[PDB]
Homo-oligomer: 106 residues x 3
């Protein structure tokens, strides 16, 4: 449900970044990604729906989103200094982390 | 500090930022806000005292402080580059989020 | 990695930062510290091995690594601006936090 919609939002803004030209477009898209990742962090993903809220699996899930958030931050920092090409290359690796998380927990 | 005291710290420093003259005052206030938001993640609002510490409700509460922390980060990054007016405008957005969290959990 | 090996990594990279000659070296060390701290967030330290993963003590432990992560970020923000000496001074606060965490949780 809502976790899946957050995953899709992350992918949409990744495509937005991959087809961007100036630094402010990349920044806007990464900011939307950060918001979607934070919204997903509080969800219970489909694979873990049968586990206790107190399970170590859910803590690992949430810390994985913290890792994604610091990767988003690095891309955003590159974009905020006008390094558009480097920001887009960092976002290419974000595609991996985002969709690996998607595929791990769906 | 308990949750209400940490929220008071957030609001006191939002006022300091609103009335600030230079970048050093804004940076000091935002650093205090960051410390308060992190400390608040260890607290429990009175209406959630009967919930499990990792219940979805308490996860939502802690991740709401993560959302605040990333908005604080944006404002502090602006203040660190001497962008005082942009940092104050971002702190005005911070007040909205702080108020919404206050209303949600008090 | 387990908690102790992550603490080893944090201490090793604090030494690297202290002796570092340029911004690339400081950025690399701080990035490794960030990774070790995020990994340690999924661990259980020796003092809390008799506590539940979702106990209040373990939530407080994870928030302590969030605090460290934001201090790492401050030093990394300085290094990203080429302010090597200021970043090393900031890493003095990391040493205090890391040492206190070692003493509290070993
Ligand atoms: Ca009060
Ligand atoms: Ca209640
Ligand atoms: Ca060892
Ligand atoms: Ca060693
Ligand atoms: Na070593
Ligand atoms: Zn947690
Ligand atoms: Zn930053």
């Amino acid at each position: 449900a809502d976790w899946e919609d957050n995953m899709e939002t992350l992918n949409d803004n990744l495509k937005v970044i991959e087809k961007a030209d100036n630094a402010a477009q990349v920044k806007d898209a990464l900011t939307k990604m950060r918001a979607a990742a934070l919204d997903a962090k509080k969800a219970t993903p489909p694979k873990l729906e049968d586990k206790s809220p107190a399970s170590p699996e859910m803590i690992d899930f949430r810390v994985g989103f913290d890792i994604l958030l610091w990767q988003i931050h690095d891309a955003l920092c590159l974009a905020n200094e006008g390094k558009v090409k480097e920001a887009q290359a960092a976002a290419e690796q974000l595609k991996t982390t985002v969709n690996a998380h998607w595929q791990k927990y769906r």
